[PDB]
């Protein structure tokens, strides 16, 4: 008669590493890391992402005539910008504080387009001839940004002082744009704005702006040696904006009532397909569907994701050393 003390063995070939020993077969274990992604974009919190398609962030938000698909109100859980999008700043020039603008827009959730300054705001100037073959639409070969208006001189009487005002009486901050034109030579200047020292000045309770045209021929881009200095700002609730100019003003026409996000905000530069699905965790290179603690797919995500880590595997032993006989 006999009794023996012993321990469990099974058919496991799953291995773990320890400080003392590599490749130890154990009876039970749990993997803590996810290396698997669904290569696509999905909804987050059942809210859809905004696909920019063939428009860049600048083209979308400036109102590039070839981005009419996007034009208006948008709600997004995150933004997807395609690497080869061709429709950005069509009339050559620099968008100032571009990286800060992207960060701002990334922190958002919804925009509402509304008319901020109707064209009839600007007394004694032409608002109907501000087009360019650098900004074709899909129909006209000479158009312009849907959110700006290129003000030119009338008949030939001198470019008067024009003025505009907007008191933001709502509850949301307003994102708006404007520009300063820089002709290539002094005759183009004269043909459009007449003679004299020109200025563009702008102010709120907390912001000041003032600039003059800087006439010079730059290398041609989209058939233009002239330039526009694009600007953006945010009009806070209760604040009022005054515009004063006597020439070279690319005026703010339409603007955006901006809803800031409570969550995180993402702008994914990717080619991945957007599909009709849900997710709680979306990385830039795909969806993760897991309960696992770590992942080695991407450090970049929106949603509730596992900790990013460079490891191939993080297998924790739970059972004991497997010694079958």
Partner 1 sequence: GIFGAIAGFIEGGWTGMIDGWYGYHHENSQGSGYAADRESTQKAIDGITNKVNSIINKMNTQFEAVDHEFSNLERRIGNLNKRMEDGFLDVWTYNAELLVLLENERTLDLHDANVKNLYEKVKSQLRDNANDLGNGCFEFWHKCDNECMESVKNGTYDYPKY
Ligand X SMILES: *[C@@H]1O[C@H](CO)[C@@H](O)[C@H](O)[C@H]1NC(C)=O
Residues 294, 36 contacting (CB under 8 angstroms): no
**Residue 287 to residue 17: CA distance in whole angstroms:** 29
Using CA atoms of 76, 79, 84, 86 in order, give the dihedral in degrees to the nearest 10.
60
Per-residue exposure over 297-313, b if at least 16 CB sit within 10 Å of its own CB, e if not: beebbbbebbeeeeeee
Looking at the Cβ atoms of 8 and 129, the one nearer to partner 1 is 8
**Residue 102 to residue 219: CA distance in whole angstroms:** 27
Binding residues for a second copy, per CB under 8 A? Answer: 92, 94, 182, 199, 201-206, 208, 210, 214-219, 221, 227, 229, 239-242, 244
Nearest residue to 271 (alpha-carbon basis) of 57, 113, 81: 81
Residue 207 touches ligand X, criterion: CB under 6 A? no
Kindly state the smallest distance separating residue 20's Cβ from partner 1, in Å: 4
Q: What would the x/- binding string for ligand X be over residues 149 to 168, using CB under 6 A?
A: ------------------x-
Looking at the Cβ atoms of 7 and 114, the one nearer to partner 1 is 7
Q: What would the x/- binding string for partner 1 be over residues 234 to 273, using CB under 8 A?
A: x-----------------------------x-xxxx----
Kindly state the smallest distance separating residue 4's Cβ from a second copy, in Å: 27
Looking at the Cβ atoms of 119 and 269, the one nearer to partner 1 is 269
DSSP string over 280-325: SEEETTEE-----SEESS-S-EEES-PEE---S--EEE-S-B----
**Which among partner 1, a second copy, ligand X, none contacts residue 23 (Cβ within 5 to 8 A by kind)?**
ligand X
**Residue 84 to residue 63: CA distance in whole angstroms:** 18
Residue 206 touches ligand X, criterion: CB under 6 A? no
Query: Of 15-23, 129-137, 172-180, 226-234, which segment contacts ligand X by CB under 6 A?
Result: 15-23
Looking at the Cβ atoms of 74 and 293, the one nearer to partner 1 is 293
Looking at the Cβ atoms of 127 and 204, the one nearer to a second copy is 204
Residues 66, 59 contacting (CB under 8 angstroms): yes
- Give the count of beta carbons closer than 10 Å to the beta carbon of residue 6: 5
Nearest residue to 83 (alpha-carbon basis) of 56, 49, 104, 51: 56
Residue 216 touches ligand X, criterion: CB under 6 A? no
Residue 156 touches partner 1, criterion: CB under 8 A? no
The contacts of residue 40 (CB under 8 Å, 6+ apart) are: 272, 273, 274, 275, 277, 286, 287
Kindly state the smallest distance separating residue 99's Cβ from partner 1, in Å: 5
Kindly state the smallest distance separating residue 305's Cβ from a second copy, in Å: 20
Nearest residue to 302 (alpha-carbon basis) of 257, 271, 261: 261
Looking at the Cβ atoms of 171 and 208, the one nearer to a second copy is 208
Residues that bind ligand X (CB under 6 A): 15, 22-23, 167, 169, 219-220, 240
Residues that bind partner 1 (CB under 8 A): 1-11, 16-22, 24, 26-27, 30, 32, 97-100, 102-104, 106-107, 234, 264, 266-269, 293-294, 299-300, 305-311, 314-325
């Amino acid at each position: 008669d006999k009794i023996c003390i012993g321990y469990h063995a099974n058919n496991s070939t799953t291995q773990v590493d320890t400080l003392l020993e590599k490749n130890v077969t154990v009876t039970h274990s749990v993997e803590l890391l996810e290396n698997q992604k669904e290569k696509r974009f999905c909804k987050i919190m059942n809210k859809a992402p905004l696909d920019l398609k063939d428009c860049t962030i600048e083209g979308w938000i400036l109102g590039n005539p070839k981005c009419d698909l996007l034009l208006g109100d948008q709600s997004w859980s995150y933004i997807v910008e395609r690497p080869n999008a061709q429709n950005g700043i069509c009339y050559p020039g620099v968008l100032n504080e571009l990286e800060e603008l992207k960060a701002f827009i990334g922190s958002g959730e919804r925009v509402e387009r509304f008319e901020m300054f109707p064209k009839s705001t600007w007394a004694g100037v032409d608002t109907s001839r501000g087009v360019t073959n650098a900004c074709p639409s899909y129909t006209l070969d000479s158009s312009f940004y849907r959110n700006l208006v290129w003000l030119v001189k009338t008949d030939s009487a001198t470019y008067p002082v024009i003025k505009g005002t907007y008191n933001n009486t709502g509850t949301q901050p307003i994102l708006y744009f404007w520009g300063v034109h820089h002709p290539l030579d002094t005759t183009v200047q004269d043909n459009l704005y007449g003679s004299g020292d020109k200025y563009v000045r702008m102010g709120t309770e907390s912001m000041n702006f003032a600039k003059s045209p800087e006439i010079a021929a730059r290398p041609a881009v989209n058939g233009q040696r002239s330039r526009i200095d694009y600007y953006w700002s945010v009009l806070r609730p209760g604040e009022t904006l005054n515009v004063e100019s006597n020439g070279n003003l690319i005026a703010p026409w339409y603007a955006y009532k901006f809803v800031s996000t409570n969550k995180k905000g993402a702008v994914f530069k990717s080619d991945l397909p957007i599909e009709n699905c849900d997710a709680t965790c979306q990385t830039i290179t795909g969806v993760l569907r897991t309960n696992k603690t770590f992942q080695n797919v991407s450090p970049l995500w929106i949603g509730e994701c596992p900790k990013y880590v460079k490891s191939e595997s993080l297998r924790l032993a739970t059972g004991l050393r497997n010694v079958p006989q």
